[PDB]
Amino acid sequence: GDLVGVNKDSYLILETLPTEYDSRVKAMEVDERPTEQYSDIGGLDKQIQELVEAIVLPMNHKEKFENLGIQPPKGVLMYGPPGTGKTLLARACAAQTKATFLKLAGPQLVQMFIGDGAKLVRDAFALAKEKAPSIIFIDELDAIGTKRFDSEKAGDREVQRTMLELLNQLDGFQPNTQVKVIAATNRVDILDPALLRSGRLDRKIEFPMPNEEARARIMQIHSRKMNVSPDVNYEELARCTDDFNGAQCKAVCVEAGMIALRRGATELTHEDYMEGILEVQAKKKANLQYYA
Amino acid sequence: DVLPPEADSSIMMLTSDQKPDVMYADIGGMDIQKQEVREAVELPLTHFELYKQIGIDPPRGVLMYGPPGCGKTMLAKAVAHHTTAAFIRVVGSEFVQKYLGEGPRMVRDVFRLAKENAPAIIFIDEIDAIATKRFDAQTGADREVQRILLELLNQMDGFDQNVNVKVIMATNRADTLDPALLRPGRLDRKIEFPLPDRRQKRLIFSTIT
Amino acid sequence: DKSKLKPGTRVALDMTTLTIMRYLPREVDPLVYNMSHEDPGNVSYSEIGGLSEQIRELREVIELPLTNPELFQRVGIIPPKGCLLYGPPGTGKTLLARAVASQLDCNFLKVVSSSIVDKYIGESARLIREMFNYARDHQPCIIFMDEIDAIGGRRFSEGTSADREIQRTLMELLNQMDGFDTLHRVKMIMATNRPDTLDPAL
Amino acid sequence: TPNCRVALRNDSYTLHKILPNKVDPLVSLMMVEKVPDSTYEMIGGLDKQIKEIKEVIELPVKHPELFEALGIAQPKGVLLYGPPGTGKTLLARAVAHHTDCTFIRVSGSELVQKFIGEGARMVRELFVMAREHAPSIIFMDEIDSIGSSRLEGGSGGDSEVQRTMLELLNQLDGFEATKNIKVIMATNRIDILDSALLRPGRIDRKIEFPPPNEEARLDILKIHSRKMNLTRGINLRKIAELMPGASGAEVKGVCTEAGMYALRERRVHVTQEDFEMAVAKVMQKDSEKNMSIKKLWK
Amino acid sequence: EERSKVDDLRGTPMSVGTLEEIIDDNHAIVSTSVGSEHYVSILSFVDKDLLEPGCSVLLNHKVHAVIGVLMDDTDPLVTVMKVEKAPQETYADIGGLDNQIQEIKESVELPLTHPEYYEEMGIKPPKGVILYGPPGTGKTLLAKAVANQTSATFLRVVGSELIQKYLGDGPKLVRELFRVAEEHAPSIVFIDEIDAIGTKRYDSNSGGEREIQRTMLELLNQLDGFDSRGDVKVIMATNRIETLDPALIRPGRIDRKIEFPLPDEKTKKRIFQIHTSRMTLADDVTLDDLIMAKDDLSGADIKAICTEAGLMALRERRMKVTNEDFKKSKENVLYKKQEGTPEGLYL
Amino acid sequence: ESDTGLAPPALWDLAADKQTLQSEQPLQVARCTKIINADSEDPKYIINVKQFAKFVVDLSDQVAPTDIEEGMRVGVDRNKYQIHIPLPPKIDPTVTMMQVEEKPDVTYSDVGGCKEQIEKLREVVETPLLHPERFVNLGIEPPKGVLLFGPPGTGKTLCARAVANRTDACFIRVIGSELVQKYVGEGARMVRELFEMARTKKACLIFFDEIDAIGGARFDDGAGGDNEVQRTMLELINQLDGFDPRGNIKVLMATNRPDTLDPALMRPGRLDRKIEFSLPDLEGRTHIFKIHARSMSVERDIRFELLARLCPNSTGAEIRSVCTEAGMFAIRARRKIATEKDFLEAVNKVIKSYAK
């Protein structure tokens, strides 16, 4: 399976230098991003420390483990409410600690023809094995995460084998300790009883909802790059922000700056955020003439 | 130069080469079905004046079916041990190929090998892969399997009417196939292999021990 | 030695004289090249426990025909074919085959049972036939197939032709295991996770 | 000259000689060259369908002035269908026997050769040979394989036998209305194939083949029992009367099982009881004779 | 003398080439019959005026240089489909469909013959006219009825003389047809059965569907290039509409969707008269009983009766056709589709 | 007859003397092929014919290894297989037709009712090109790139036209189906060429229309053999960033399906502001009725509020279709003006047929 350089007449292997793969796998090699600090995520610092206690020390200090005799795991899951800390945390981990990032989407494994995802996943890991400092990041894994049970047409072939080829690549017959696996879902209930536990994953890192001080902590960081007046109460912001994630709290922070840009004001007030919050859900009906 | 004919297409199966090692009486329990296949395959090759005197014209082929574990291949190998005519082994999924057109051509390729050779015997194991009944073949792959059924259907009872050749089939479940295969004239022996009852277990217990 | 030129062998012709220089055994179709060259775990039945009633019983059916055929000639029995591993996920099922492929590894193949079909409709059964011929030629081999459930299934009615290929794939696997060709010195360790929806003919 | 071949030099590419014997590769399936295979009387029963075929083939050719005097054309498309096939092959050979005419047999899978264009090329090279010999009848076989339905492009369709099928509609109609050439189409189950050529602009004759009647079962039974040995005191009519709507193909199957039961006694004599066990063996239908499925519904 | 030197300057076994593109610098790119493309030079006596992308030239074996341009009967595929002679009866052939005649007259004859209603107000004429409905509901007969009463040329496209396998012949004949529509009178583009080419807008990866989607897109491009069309009328007709291209049903391209509903026993009596007109109708036959009994039959069925009535007269060696022949043709031919009706339940 | 380019002898008589002979032996025959990849500091070009084979060859000593990139036609020697002259894939008849710089005949009053979206388009386009100081004086980045999305026929083009006639400088409309080409790697060179030639002049506005074709639709899920939608999309998101700060050329997109939405495009730097288009409540519809009826001869004693009441859910394309239909009813009879009942039957013809 090598693309050697052969003479046209004498048929002699002259040079080899192949380094060739599928176009879709080479499209997935995503590296060299701008950096991001761990202090950008507020309120989820325990899960950040549980990541620093999971991945970098198998990479940095292998001799920290080999004297104790233990073996580092290689599967970490992000799950919880969507839009909080799943993709953005590993984006910053690949930003500072450069370890040859390799994303993997969910529906891109699902192709039209039969027998494509088992080609695509296995070619994605042959590339991951040859690049020794590389890592693997898998996102929206619930999109191919069924329960293997309901033999209902026609997802018994396009999702199942793409799952079960992937499941055979985690432990398999032959070990694979060179590369690390990071998965990111939103639904734990839909996942295969083989797509869970140790060997594969076991590191259920739950993400709670960001609280009032956490939402006050997220909004301060996104507002730091802009001009903000120092007379901003974070108690009022923590109170009025209800059931928001950091994505929505970022979207409030953008809208509060743009309203100040319309009137030309070089500062922000709490009313600028109270306008920015109500702009998000597109404030609507007063009554329904059923309720007196 | 002009070559001798059939310098050509694929395998001459064994005819003496690696032939299966089983005796005829190695079968335990089968008595009617053991005799019925012999009476329409082997006995036509040996005793020929008995048929032409009465006007029997022994059948072109035989369909075998039933649940797994009754003896299909082992009974066929006892025929393949004790025949003197040409045997032909054919895997039923041998013609499934990607190259369009060669599927129906290989069925044409095997039967010309049978016509040049001895009063041969053709065995194809799985028929349920190729013989299922038809509908609007709305895919490409459904049209692939469908036309090879008909080339098989044409070169079994056409205008030439290939003489002295026998087509032995041994399916698993013979209802999910085409009804124009089950018509008499190609498959005149609808032999079932049921599970062995009492008075036969003691025959099978004897032959093992 | 023209007697070695069987009608169906492979040779190497001259470029200009075109006559036969050297004959070759058989192609080994590099899709299954990677299905042999791998190390199990360098284990020695010491990474396993609480299964010794089932370990020894599996070592009984496999290790005897590939070492000790005199115990099977003294008793009027045919040496057996392969076994099956079924149960809930987590208790062996891969390390157990990893154990037996470390002890007396003459030849070994590990089939994933999900890299065996593709877009092409006649490729699947062609890959299985050329697999076992590699296994048949290198006589004292052991065959492991994970996840038979992937190509299992009960053979049912009208089934939207993408599943008809899997049935025709399975019918090829039936006749190659127990069919016309006498499978000798070749044993097959099958392994599944749900032993409910498989073929009763299998 | 139309469809003329030449001898061409290979280095200078110059003409060498006009070749004779106009283009017709693979004529082994065609030009059957042997008339005696079956006589005329061995069919029986279905005598109406014979007169329909004799007067759609021999009548336009031998007496064309009957049809060229009215003001209408001659029919050239003949469809034949019978779902168990109650005489399709035997009826065509007796026509091919008793015609004194050149005959062309075309199997319905031999146009998909390996790759593109080649099976589409031999179509035009085929019918010019049938036009080269004006007394000729082309016979198709199982056109279910060649042409079912015009699907989409290369996604979920073949789109290659569409290229060959489109020629066959165009080769007989669209350029020149041919003459003295009659095609015969024999396949059953008319829903799979296309209905575009099934319009009366192309096919004028659609002859069905019903299951045989009691006298029709009796006459086929007398043909197969003619070459056999019979004992006196036997009724062939009751054998046809014990066949509730038979197929005619199983009249052979009774005559095989009856002679085979006489074989295992080493006896050249046969009774009516041997036929009664032969019919009852072949009558294996999934009819569920519990007297409760056909009996809750009187 | 000079003509013989240049006719002998090139090689004698001239190979039939194929142009692909033209660069104006004494060379071009061509294509062989095997698809191998050769970056060759072009001569100067090659008469560089007829050189079009898609034509054929003459090439060498040594350097494969462009020897000379090759004719190809100049276009065998736009002159066959052009109607030269007269179609069927003008307006008296059809019957009962006079609701739709004012549609097609005012959309075609009125932009051409009297283009002043559009100038008193400023309302542009329509371009696309769609004819759909039941299969064989009289769309062929109606298109020939309108095309008879005309003062301009008419074009008749089958629909299967558009798709080839030469990778460029698809979008080529679009410009070949519309040039004939431009050079001649502002003709009526009638491309029948456009449903085989235009449906659901799918893209695959093989080389089988790519000759369809581009030609579909190029026709939609060449219809609405919006540079100069000269009032080209386009009539498009299929049977079905629900598995067709939705972006041609949207406005901006076609704003006429003419449907042909099912007729009654009123329209039949002319069709019985027209089909029983060019025959030896004997004066002892009755047709009015055949109209009254059967309640579902089309123009194809009556023509199938008239041929069967013609065949039964020739069997017993006669010239005229008797009444029992029409009765036996009514009871033999029309027994093929009578299945399914709710009788005795409705009032 | 065998014409073979007769060319009556006045234009080639001097050309047929020896200029043909200098085109035979010095001028060799080359072949055009495809480049797969390249290597650094040593060329080592891997090139296929796709009919013969794949070849690992080198450029000859006549050109420079500067223009030779992946996916480019070259002049291959017939024997030594060397690249002699690189061929461009037929550049560039798709730029002069785009940047027409032509005055459009669209009144600014032709977009009425949806005034909230005009000012949002006014701040993004007009203000950082003519008053960029307010973005400097505060500390927010100048916005570049705004995706447009909503129902079709809403007036996506007219809002994209209302900024076109405002400044009258370098208006470029990109058709989304135009970049769908046959050749592999054909449109990705053009997006390089369209970007580099728009930066030679200042105050240029490029609009992307029907980005359901190439603007990140299904990124690569249906094309398993072609791979051109992906190669153009990966090239345009690469060339969009990496440079151009502070605003020189504004880029706008518009889609119909609100599904083809990349989160990587929603990284700040590519697409920042969300501007969508919605349906008129009452008066934006009646704004369409008054414009689409002055062009034709109508009655001066009719109203257009009654027609918008009969259109609960409708676009201006549908309203235009009524005005064309109601015009034809006056053309059925001999009416030279448009009365009210022609409109009333047209509304019952359009809406009460298939819509509701």
Ligand SMILES: Nc1ncnc2c1ncn2[C@@H]1O[C@H](COP(=O)(O)OP(=O)(O)OP(=O)(O)O)[C@@H](O)[C@H]1O
């Ligand atoms: N009546 C019998 N006498 C002796 N051996 C038998 C008998 N029935 C079954 N066997 C044994 O059982 C095994 C299975 O039989 P066989 O291989 O013929 O299966 P089959 O009938 O071909 O079809 P399937 O494989 O679906 O069961 C054989 O190897 C044979 O040794």
Ligand SMILES: Nc1ncnc2c1ncn2[C@@H]1O[C@H](COP(=O)(O)OP(=O)(O)OP(=O)(O)O)[C@@H](O)[C@H]1O
């Ligand atoms: N019975 C056992 N004895 C010792 N170790 C075990 C046992 N079962 C599992 N292990 C441990 O589990 C790991 C191997 O996993 P194992 O092969 O059991 O997964 P599996 O059962 O094959 O999963 P699946 O059934 O989903 O394929 C090894 O690291 C081993 O230490």
Ligand SMILES: Nc1ncnc2c1ncn2[C@@H]1O[C@H](COP(=O)(O)OP(=O)(O)OP(=O)(O)O)[C@@H](O)[C@H]1O
């Ligand atoms: N009327 C008949 N006269 C003589 N033989 C008949 C008649 N009907 C049926 N047969 C017998 O039936 C068998 C099938 O006949 P034939 O070959 O014409 O049909 P077929 O087209 O092969 O059937 P199918 O359409 O199912 O393929 C033949 O062996 C023939 O002897």
Ligand SMILES: Nc1ncnc2c1ncn2[C@@H]1O[C@H](COP(=O)(O)OP(=O)(O)O)[C@@H](O)[C@H]1O
């Ligand atoms: N605690 C936080 N600190 C900073 N940014 C946050 C925080 N929570 C959410 N965000 C913002 O929300 C966006 C969505 O997070 P993401 O990783 O995409 O979650 P998911 O992958 O589940 O959608 C991120 O781009 C990030 O900018």
Ligand SMILES: Nc1ncnc2c1ncn2[C@@H]1O[C@H](COP(=O)(O)OP(=O)(O)O)[C@@H](O)[C@H]1O
């Ligand atoms: N304010 C308005 N005044 C007049 N006509 C309008 C107005 N808004 C929309 N339209 C109509 O809507 C149509 C929009 O057409 P188009 O540009 O195809 O929309 P899209 O780009 O959304 O598909 C225009 O033809 C125009 O006649």
Ligand SMILES: [Mg+2]
């Ligand atoms: Mg068996």
Ligand SMILES: [Mg+2]
């Ligand atoms: Mg396992």
Ligand SMILES: [Mg+2]
């Ligand atoms: Mg037949």
